[PDB]
Design a protein around this nucleic acid. Structure first.
Lengths: 64, 206, 145, 54
RNA sequence: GUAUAGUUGAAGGAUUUGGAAAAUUCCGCUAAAGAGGGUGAAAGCCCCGUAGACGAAAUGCUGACAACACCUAGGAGGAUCCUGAGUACGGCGGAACACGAGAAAUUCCGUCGGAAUCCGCGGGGACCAUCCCGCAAGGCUAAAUACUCCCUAGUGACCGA
RNA sequence: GAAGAGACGGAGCCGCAGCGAAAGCGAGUCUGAAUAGGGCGAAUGAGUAUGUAGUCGUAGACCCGAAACCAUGUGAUCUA
């Protein structure tokens, strides 16, 4: 039978055109009065793939 | 592509010219190799099977205890280390067939037929006719053309008085103009064929 | 080449059979080493498991939605047109009909990369704001039908 | 209470959820009443649902 | 026409080693039959067969086409009448839909309420309006699909105690 | 079509264009007041079909081994 892709990563990660993946940062949906104002600016913007976690995840997101 | 013509014994009328798209194209060798293996490996029946532990007509209780007896521990009578037990990883029914793309098949056909042209093994007969199916006369036909080895006869349509005279020695196997495969040709040494069979080959093979 | 055969060079490998004696290199535990659940029968954890550490997908947040009525097109840029020399009515038929646009998706859009020197005519369903200028520079005619 | 004589009501079974969705098995039974009716003029006693007494 | 008994069906001798030849050496013959099995060892020409050709008293099956059963009419008008009831649908509690009450349409089940009649009624994923597509609460229906206890005839880079 | 090679069959699938959650725009786009800066793209940058081999996933998945669990049945000739 076919593989089944993960439905936790399809709702969190979208694939770019160069090969990598776009990722949305964390620590954004909670208390903010603890955090500073440089932090809450610099945690709006998306980051890329670290090549450690691209190994074990690659086969799950086989087509999406 | 210039092949002479024979009557039944009369010799060398005008030599038939053939399409250089087909009969002159310098055969690839790996294509013919994989065509032969794909053909001959597609002839298998796959019917063979072996029972295992859940299919051996046995029982499902520990005969012993785990302790007290002092012998090693067993779960059931029938399991692969016993005699009469099941078998681990036996052969199961498969099908072994697979189809190449639709360019290499015609590349194989063209390559084989150009190979047999370049070594002068097509002997084109102007036309074969028997009033009755007499296998002795067909032997005399092959004696007139002086061919001895494993040979092919390619026929046209219902030549029922020329196809009913080929249950000969194994020099001869006979295919009509439609069922010409690869293994029917590569196994043989020479090919006899009529004029019209060449034309109906050049319709399908363009 | 007849029945009594050669493969291509490098065309077919052999195999590697595992658990057959201590001088092939894979006898006594079969390339698995000593104990542990990567070395039992059928062991190994599921994919993406990292111990009880919360894995990467339960660490970064869910985001977005999908439109139900997304209508995206079947883009041809501009150089693909540059072999239909003069006067064709480029269209969602005869334009395709040689191996150019199989499977138009919602109608054909045209883009502007990168040089057209003809006098064609185009019938598509959308156009960029530079492809019209590139076509009318070369003297053609366009219509969004 | 086994069946109806006129309709097709009979006892059956279904689940039972309770406030944190734990399921067991019920016995959902129809309301039935022993009613003296006139079957071909001769009176009998038979089980009839109250639904057919409207 | 076919199924269950069948008929007929071409062509070889001698020598050497042998316990015994189909083996070997000379010279022949056949083929619409050179698939297979058996014979004192390995056979186109010894036997049983095969290709071809022919054949059914009795019972069953399948086509066919006769007979006999059945079934099936047009155009216009639109005053009045008919078109499936404790049914549709709603509340409550459960189930079935990929859908776990969820913003939850559509299908059933238990109980309690409970409509309209063509100027009508349902549906288009809560709901309303507009548009579009359809007439529930009465029945029947071949083939394409899944299986093999058993029968006949075959095959296998399936096993050989 | 001989359980076959062997032709028809162009529904479909993959590559040729990306960015954005999206409306959309397009060799460019997103955030932004910004023609600023930045992310991700493009600037020759080749895929696809089949065979074979290494690894992984779903299936018992390299085999042997429990204590226990659930559903039908069989027993009071021993013993209470």
């Amino acid at each position: 039978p076919k593989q089944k892709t993960h439905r936790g990563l399809a709702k969190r990660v979208k694939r770019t055109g160069g090969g990598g993946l776009k990722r949305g940062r964390a620590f954004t949906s909670h208390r903010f009065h603890g955090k500073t104002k440089k932090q809450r600016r610099q945690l709006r913007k998306a980051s890329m793939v670290a090549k450690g976690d691209y190994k074990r995840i690659r086969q799950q997101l086989a087509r999406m | 592509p210039n092949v002479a013509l024979f009557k039944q014994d009369g010799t060398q009328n005008g030599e038939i010219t053939l399409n250089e798209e087909i009969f002159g194209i310098e055969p690839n060798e790996s294509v013919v190799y994989d065509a032969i293996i794909m053909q001959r490996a597609s002839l298998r029946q796959g019917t063979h099977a072996v029972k295992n532990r859940s299919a051996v007509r046995g029982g499902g209780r520990k005969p012993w205890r785990q302790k007290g007896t002092g012998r090693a521990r067993q779960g059931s009578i029938r399991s692969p280390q016993w005699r009469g037990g099941g078998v681990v990883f036996g052969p199961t029914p498969r099908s072994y067939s697979y189809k190449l793309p639709k360019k290499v098949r015609r590349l194989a056909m063209k390559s084989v037929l150009s190979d047999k042209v370049a070594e002068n093994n097509l002997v084109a007969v102007e036309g074969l006719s028997f009033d009755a199916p007499k296998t002795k006369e067909f032997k005399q036909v092959l004696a007139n053309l002086s061919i001895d080895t494993k040979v092919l006869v390619v026929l046209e349509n219902g030549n029922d008085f020329a196809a009913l005279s080929a249950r000969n020695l194994p020099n001869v196997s006979v295919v009509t103009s439609d069922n010409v495969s690869v293994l029917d040709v590569v196994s043989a040494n020479k090919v006899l064929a009529t004029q019209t069979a060449l034309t109906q080959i050049e319709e399908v093979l363009a | 080449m007849k029945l009594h055969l050669k493969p291509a060079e490098g065309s077919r490998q052999v195999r590697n059979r595992v658990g057959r004696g201590t001088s092939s290199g894979n006898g006594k535990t079969a390339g698995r080493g000593q104990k542990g659940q990567k070395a039992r029968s059928g062991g190994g954890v599921r994919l993406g498991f990292e111990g009880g550490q919360t894995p990467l997908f339960r660490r970064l947040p869910k985001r977005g939605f999908t439109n139900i009525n997304r209508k995206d097109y079947a883009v041809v840029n501009l150089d693909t047109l540059n072999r239909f020399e003069d006067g064709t009515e480029v269209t969602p038929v005869v334009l395709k009909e040689a191996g150019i646009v199989k499977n138009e998706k919602a109608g054909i859009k045209v883009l502007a990369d990168g040089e057209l020197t003809k006098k064609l005519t185009v019938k598509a369903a959308k156009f960029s704001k530079s492809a019209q200028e590139a076509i009318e520079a070369a003297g053609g005619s366009i219509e969004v039908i | 209470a086994k069946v109806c004589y006129f309709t097709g009501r009979k006892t059956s079974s279904g689940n039972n959820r309770s406030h944190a969705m734990n399921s067991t098995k019920r016995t959902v039974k129809p309301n039935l009443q022993k009613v003296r009716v006139l079957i071909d003029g001769k009176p009998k006693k038979v089980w009839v649902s109250a639904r057919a007494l409207k």
